[PDB]
Amino acid sequence: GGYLVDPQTSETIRGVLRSTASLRQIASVVNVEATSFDVLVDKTDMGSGWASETAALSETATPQIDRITIPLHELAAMPKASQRLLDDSAFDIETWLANRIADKFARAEAAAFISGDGVDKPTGFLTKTKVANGAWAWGSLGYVATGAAGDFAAVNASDAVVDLVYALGAEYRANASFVMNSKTAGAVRKMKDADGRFLWAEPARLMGYPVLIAEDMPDIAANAYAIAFGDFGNGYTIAERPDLRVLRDPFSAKPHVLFYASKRVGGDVSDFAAIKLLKFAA
Amino acid sequence: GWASETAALSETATPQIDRITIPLHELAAMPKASQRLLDDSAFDIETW
């Protein structure tokens, strides 16, 4: 009798639910169907006079302009699904792969927006020629150092963070956020005062500002930049094509299908003043 | 892949699948009530 059972299957083929925190929900996403996005910033400001009645005004300075090029690279996967499976497999494999591929792309481009170099991937804000804050230029991200090489400072811990906040400018702090990984927010949560009760009282906010728990920022290493903070809505611009072009090719490998999916995404920092970092050197 | 412009894109991985069975056992209770009680006990003992 045990042959008359037919165990029931799921409705949808589930999957391990990996992190979708991608810095894309806070950065400036701009849909462009071109080969590059040229964002235009004003690295300086104007001048004003408090004129008199008989001043005979002269020229006031005019802001000088900078152009940043977003090369808009592309990202491609080609999973080869058999043809005997696609028709015998009452689940929908065509829309599962497309749902699963877009998941892998949103997770592969998430790492590129942070620690991605320039070669055929977005230049993450961590590869942007970091300069010690206070000696801040325009073509560089300003960082504040904590003290001891590995961890936070030995005496005034949490002061390398509270000045990282107030080193960013009054206007970008209005909507800014920390960026760490899971292992650093834990290393921050474990910070405790002279008694043992940790001194930091669903966004998992810190000091009132939101925290985007990425999974791609470097750990707390000798000279790593594990904590960033800034208004990525103005500091980081993402250019992309907001779709997923899936070309199924039942031709190359003939008894298979060989889906060829590819999205195009790029991005660099737009405002070097809108992202401040935390180095652990000294 | 982070495909290049001229790279001749090759095969990529494919997620493997695991099936987990839920044998769906059963759970039985058998209380015994006297028929004299079920008639004389204005509280609905059937539904209780």
């Binding site: 005997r84 499976l85 497999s89 599962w96 | 997620p15 493997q16």
Partner: peptide
């Protein structure tokens, strides 16, 4: 999403 022969795929 591969051959329907091998169960693991």
């Amino acid at each position: 999403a591969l051959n329907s022969a091998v169960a693991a795929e």
